[PDB]
């Protein structure tokens, strides 16, 4: 009584979840914080040139 009639909604939700988030900008500042690990996320640049270890490539991506 649940007629299959198209692509299941629940599966496409998982797949569009990965494409949705855009790159982060415009973070607000609190001197009460004065710094956050969140600010690091906006700031870090996350570059290339790994170490040739088997996992160091994966860690660096």
């Amino acid at each position: 009584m649940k007629v299959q009639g198209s692509v299941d909604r629940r599966r496409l939700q998982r797949r569009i979840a990965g494409l949705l988030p855009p790159p982060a900008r415009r973070l607000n500042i609190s001197r009460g914080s004065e710094f956050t690990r969140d600010v690091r996320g906006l700031v870090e640049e996350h570059a290339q040139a790994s170490s040739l270890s088997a996992a160091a490539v994966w860690r660096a991506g």
Binding site: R25, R26, L27, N28, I29, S30, V39, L42, V43, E45
Partner: protein, 50 residues
């Protein structure tokens, strides 16, 4: 140095640096403050400007 038929009036602007005193009464203006941000723009090949 003969005097031509006409005479001339000369105008010139002169300027003066000064030190000023300012008075402003108590509770005369109300201010509304919003939160600050941080933003990223214009990443060049060597640097990133915020």
């Amino acid at each position: 140095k003969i005097h031509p038929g006409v005479a001339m009036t000369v105008v010139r602007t002169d300027e003066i640096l000064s030190e000023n005193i300012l008075f402003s009464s108590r509770a005369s203006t109300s201010m509304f403050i919003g939160t600050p941000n941080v933003s990223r723009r214009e990443a060049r090949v060597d640097a990133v400007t915020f």
